[PDB]
Each structure stands twice: as structure tokens, then as C-alpha cells.
Amino acid sequence: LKGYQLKGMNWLANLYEQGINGILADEMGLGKTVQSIALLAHLAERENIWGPFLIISPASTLNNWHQEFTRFVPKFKVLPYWGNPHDRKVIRRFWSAPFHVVITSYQLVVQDVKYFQRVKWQYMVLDEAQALKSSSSVRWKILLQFQCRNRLLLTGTPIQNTMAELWALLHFIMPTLFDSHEEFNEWENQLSRLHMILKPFMLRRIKKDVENELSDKIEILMYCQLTSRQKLLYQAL
Amino acid sequence: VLIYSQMTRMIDLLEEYMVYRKHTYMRLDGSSKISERRDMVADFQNRN
């Protein structure tokens, strides 16, 4: 593990003892899955073994988690949960707790709610939690109801839209502390308030502090001139 | 190279181009099956 990852582990371990949820908002390419997996890799305490974890994620990502668990923590055993209704139904028999962790997609967890309500999951890893950004969403409304010790969000480039989404993400992290969007109309007059509210739970890295061995992105904007056929249509519009 | 594009209708036009000038290519629309994504990523690593 790298130094910033280990400092992440000590920080997460403090939050774990304190019973505090938060955002592991490192910049993409620094090992946010690897950090979450290290909540198991060094976990001699055994509490995290004999009760099931959920990983909930957007669809393309279901693969990497399996490879990352199997490469870093062969101490564990992992369940797929996607594909045919038949395979889902079959796998429900095996978790009817050596099924130490289950890998899942947002689009299935928002439907198979009845099955997920049947068991007391220890923790939810909501991978790339920027998916949950709107409280108007069924996804958000339903994902609030599952019961667990911690809800862990691994979303890089978080928040960054409008204050309704800030409230939605922060109230997903804590059911207390926040009641309405009106608080966030009163929260450098604005910026400092938000910074101090986020600081107890919201790690950062920024690439240039840690990716010292990588090249910087050379970023080109190339202007193009549209063709005669494009002119005729664009004008007609 | 990775090419990113914001319309499935356009990724079809790009595929017609990749076939015409014979570059070799591989595409992963949201309409691709979850099992295809696994093979297709694992083939973009591990190969020249």
C-alpha cells in the first residue's frame, strides 16, 4: 500500500470506531477500490468477515471489483449478482455467512429490494456514488432504507453541480445533521462554511501532490470549419 | 487511442469509418452486454 492509502486506512479506521459515514473523494487513478479493499486486507479483527458486505456500483465496473478482491484478498469469498433471472434466483440460495461479499449494480438493487431487505448487511460500499446525486431519484429514495453500520462512498470528482445535490449526497451520508435545502442557502462567506462542514468527513488528494511520476495531460482544443453540406443544413435550421 | 462520443447514431458512423480505413477497432455502447465488456477490456490490455 502507498503512504496516502495507509493514511486513508487510519482515517477510515477512526471513522469506523466513531460510527461516521463520509466521502473518499480521491482523484481518479489513485486506488479508491484498493483503499476500500484494505478495510478487509489488514482486518485481523474478524468482525468484517462473518457478516456480508454489499458493493453497489454502475454496470461496467462489476468486473474490476472481482479481479481486485481475488488479487488483493484471497482470504475472502465473493458473489456475483447480475445477469439472468435464473442465475440471480440460484445465487439467492447460497446467501439464504461464508458469502463474505456481494457485487451488485444500481439497476438491480433498485428492483430486487425485497431480497436485499431479507439480510442484515454489515456495510454498503456505494461505488461511484455520484450516481446518487439527485434526491428526486427512486435510486436515492430506496437506497436510504437499507440498514448497515456504515455507508461508504468512493466517488472521485464529487458534488460540483448545485446545492440540491449537495444536500442529497450529505443527507444520504448522514440521516441527522441536515433537514432541508434552506440550511445550504446560508452555507469566502459561503465557501468557508461548506469547507468546515465537509472537513470532518471528505478526504482529498489532488493529482499533482501524489501522481508525481505521471506526465501532465497535454490538452488540445482543435477548431474545425464545417463543410458546404453542413452550411446549407445549419442555415436552413 | 480512445475515442469518446455522445450519440449512438454517431458511433455507428465512426464504426463505418473504422471499417473503411482498415484500422482495427472495438466498441462498448451502453447497449453492450455486461459479459462483452469483460472480454473487450481484457483484449485492449494484453495486446498490441
Binding site: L79, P80, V90, R93, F94 | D39, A42
Partner: peptide, 29 residues
């Protein structure tokens, strides 16, 4: 008496875990 249902349910257990092994390894590719 009870051995029939017991060894049947034991056979169903190895049947289940064989399906678990197979349908877990469907996630490889």
C-alpha cells in the same frame, strides 16, 4: 428412517454448491 431425507438433502447441498462453483465462474469472462 431419517437417513433417506438427510442423504437426499446432503445430495441437494453438493448439487447447490456445484451450481455455485459454475455460476460463480461464469463471472470470469
Amino acid at each position: 428412517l431419517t437417513e433417506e431425507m438427510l442423504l437426499k438433502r446432503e445430495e441437494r447441498a453438493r448439487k447447490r454448491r456445484l451450481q455455485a462453483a459454475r455460476r460463480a465462474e461464469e463471472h470470469k469472462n
